[PDB]
Write a protein that binds this ligand. Structure first.
Ligand SMILES: Cc1cn([C@H]2C[C@H](O)[C@@H](COP(=O)(O)OP(=O)(O)Oc3ccccc3)O2)c(=O)[nH]c1=O
Ligand SMILES: Cc1cn([C@H]2C[C@H](O)[C@@H](COP(=O)(O)OP(=O)(O)Oc3ccccc3)O2)c(=O)[nH]c1=O
Ligand SMILES: C[S@@+](CC[C@H](N)C(=O)[O-])C[C@H]1O[C@@H](n2cnc3c(N)ncnc32)[C@H](O)[C@@H]1O
Ligand SMILES: C[S@@+](CC[C@H](N)C(=O)[O-])C[C@H]1O[C@@H](n2cnc3c(N)ncnc32)[C@H](O)[C@@H]1O
Lengths: 241, 241
């Protein structure tokens, strides 16, 4: 039903991804070490599709200035509360223009898969290049590629916090050149009873070559790293191709 | 939504109660030892609201003849497959008449709480007495009493079998003289995706005295045993009051 990271889905986001084991503190430390490898003097970072601003909160401990861009107002509201001294823009990775550049431009946890087709992917990569300093680095965490996607995958987990029990179950299928992921939730607590929610997303299965193509078209040199924080690896790009 | 143990709810019953830890083999052994305490020569047993026939399957190893009665055709279908050599009647605990008596008449796992009011409870207890041999025993596992019910209770568990993942979440609230239990399910598998189901039941909170009253009115001597297989204790009754 929803595909827009809104309402109760946005409110549940952080608890469910923490319950699944996601460690944004570690991921931010790793990201900052990776960035400083390619740009030793790096000072500022823009996190695109920053969601609830969990990486930004931790990256602020490593970078003098951090900033975000996010499409969903409800995600953004959470992010702004968590990062009250940073600028967080409501906008679209396909066409934003902030009039400034950063040491690092990051786009994490498969947000890039919400783009449809090579044209949107190239457009986003060009915007990321349009916002990186000449000595900086772009980091994009892809969705699954066709060559590593597992169709029929079922993930189920339950987490409890503050008196509330949340179960999240996903099923991922092949829909042409994308994954269809259906996600259902049961949210329960003594005072509120049980509520059911659902999300459904089409997330594009770009090949590695297609990602590399978008980096190249944007003037970035590209390298893929397998494994990565979420099993999908990580691409890094440097201006100067 | 449903309150009638039908369709997919009936199909999910055994897997969810097994995942929650219910051991019908142990409960049947205990029940047979309890019965033989009060009726050493006991030979036959009628399980009323026998559901999917899980106690009957195991009790058949202890009693020469076992038989069941169940209101829901879909539960009964499962029970009949599991117990192909026994007679399993489609009927109602409030008014059935089988024209024969048994060494033991059992009614397990709070099925008795599906009755509304003292009149139905007394009617069922009189039917149970109308089907027990003079030297036999009646065993009724109650629902919660007002004095031991915990309102706001949330139970969540996930079990996997045969490629299918099932999450069941319940919330129990006080509705006058009953509990309102709402139960939601998520059923997931690689081939079938995710489906959501729900049940809602009103289950009467009779006091211990009200149970004892129904046994007495039916000519049975009554004893309550705390704890029991499901935390609600157990009543046993003997003809001859
Ligand atoms: C398909 C798939 C999943 N997983 C692993 C990956 C993950 O550990 C788990 C699936 O969990 P779920 O909540 O559905 O997806 P995420 O955690 O990625 O969250 C997001 C969902 C959509 C957009 C972005 C992020 O199984 C794989 O290892 N291979 C696969 O092909
Ligand atoms: C209210 C309540 C529950 N529990 C325990 C009892 C149980 O271990 C758990 C609740 O699990 P759930 O699936 O909702 O109920 P059942 O397993 O009884 O199944 C049936 C439901 C309805 C009709 C018959 C049987 O919490 C308690 O200890 N006290 C309570 O007051
Ligand atoms: C899986 S979440 C990842 C959020 C965050 N980066 C993290 O690691 O938790 C995907 C995010 O992409 C955002 N998003 C989707 N399409 C977008 C677009 N065109 N521009 C900006 N953000 C977008 C969603 O609103 C959501 O916050
Ligand atoms: C919680 S289930 C217990 C089933 C079984 N005794 C067990 O231990 O698994 C409650 C059962 O009561 C049955 N039931 C409800 N009202 C009934 C009635 N009036 N007569 C007979 N069975 C009834 C339901 O159809 C269901 O099978």
């Amino acid at each position: 039903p929803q595909a827009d990271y809104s309402g109760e889905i946005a409110e549940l986001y952080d608890l469910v991804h923490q319950g699944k084991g996601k460690d944004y503190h570690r991921e931010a430390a790793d990201l900052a070490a990776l960035v400083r490898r390619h740009s030793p003097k790096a000072a500022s970072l823009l996190d695109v599709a920053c969601g609830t601003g969990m990486h930004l909160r931790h990256l602020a401990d490593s970078f003098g200035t951090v900033e975000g861009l996010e499409l969903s107002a409800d995600m953004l509201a959470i992010a702004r509360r968590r990062n009250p001294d940073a600028v967080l823009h409501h906008g679209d990775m396909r066409d934003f223009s902030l009039g400034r550049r950063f040491s690092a431009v990051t786009c994490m946890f498969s947000s890039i898969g919400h783009l449809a087709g090579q044209a949107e992917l190239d457009a986003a990569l060009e915007r990321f290049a349009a916002h990186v300093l000449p000595d900086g680095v772009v980091v994009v965490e892809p969705w699954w590629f066709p060559e590593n996607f597992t169709p029929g995958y079922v993930a189920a987990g339950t987490v409890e916090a503050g008196g509330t029990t949340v179960t999240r179950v996903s099923h991922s299928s092949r829909e042409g050149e994308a994954t269809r992921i259906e996600v259902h939730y049961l949210v329960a607590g003594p005072d509120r009873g049980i509520t059911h929610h659902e999300e459904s997303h089409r997330i594009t299965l770009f090949t590695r070559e297609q990602y590399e193509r978008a980096f190249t078209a944007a003037g970035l040199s590209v390298e893929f790293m397998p494994g990565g924080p979420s099993g999908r690896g990580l691409f890094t790009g440097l201006p100067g191709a």
